[PDB]
């Protein structure tokens, strides 16, 4: 393994259409090349498990993980978290639970016997969080009291609810809120049922066998970002420093999934 590679392989959680993700992250790629003196190669894997496996086998250097996929990768490989974005004045985010207007689902209790869409099994806000909300508020258990279907991206959750393939679904609040704008769905076909509480934001992480000098530089460059052109694509105000213990809440909640 190379401690100080000339090219940095930088993976992005596949929570949306890969072209959308490459587009959104272009200004950050340009900023990193300038301030790190490295070439940057952006990667989007086919699913969450393939990004976790790429990290374990040393095939990527930096990764933008979700909270649950981060704690899963950290259990399998030697990695460290270093930054997360501050969006809307907070270092946290929420899941939204949505329903198709034609399904007969008017509240959480009405999901008994119906079809729920989740994203990836390793998703925080399109699986773990909404599943926990349905259990704690309505005493509903996935696969036992309702059908669960895993459709991949958060984009796919919104599409499958809106077109009638699912009756309800759970996903990231920010991703849902821009789905009509991007032309993914007709917003008249869906309604919001409710929201989760606030959970720690997606962490940036790197393989811990990079050199100490390179790891310090990566952390300093990200936390120092105040360029409006980089921040605007994310609707962010800053990149904040983080530690592994910030994700213990997710570890504890993950006991319900057998982690």
Numbering used by the authors: 2 to 260
Excerpt from the publication:
We over-produced and purified PBPs of three putative phosphite transporters; PtxB from the globally important marine diazotroph Trichodesmium erythraeum IMS101 (Te_PtxB), PhnD from the oceanic picocyanobacteria Prochlorococcus marinus MIT9301 (Pm_PhnD)35 and PtxB from the soil bacterium Pseudomonas stutzeri WM88 (Ps_PtxB), as well as a PBP from a putative hypophosphite transporter, HtxB, also from P. stutzeri WM88 (HtxB)18. The structures reveal that ligand specificity, measured here by thermophoresis, arises from a combination of steric considerations and the interaction between a ligand P-H hydrogen atom and an aromatic π system in the binding pocket. The structures of two distinct types of phosphite-binding protein and a hypophosphite-binding protein reveal that a P-H…π interaction ensures high-affinity binding of specific ligands, representing a universal mechanism in these PBPs for recognising ligands with a P-H bond.
We also obtained structures of phosphite and MPn complexed Ps_PtxB and determined the associated ligand affinities; both the structures and binding data were similar to the other phosphite-binding proteins discussed previously. Analysis of the conformational change between the open and closed, phosphite-bound structure of Ps_PtxB using DynDom42 revealed that domain closure is induced by a ~60° rotation around an axis that lies between the two lobes. This is facilitated by flexible loops that form the hinge region between the lobes (residues A85-T93 and Y200-Q202), as well as residues from the extreme end of the C-terminal helix (G255-L258). Superposition of the individual lobes of Ps_PtxB in the open and closed conformations shows that lobe 2 (residues 96–196, 0.35 Å RMSD cα) adopts a very similar structure, with the conserved STS-H motif (S124, T125, S126 and H155) spatially conserved in both conformations. The positions of Y94, which hydrogen bonds to one of the phosphite oxygen atoms in the closed structure, and D16, which hydrogen bonds to and stabilises the capping tyrosine in the closed structure, move ~7 Å and ~4.5 Å (cα-cα), respectively, on ligand binding. In addition, the B-factors of the core residues in lobe 2 are much lower in the closed, ligand bound, conformation compared to those in the open structure, implying lower overall flexibility when phosphite is bound to the protein.
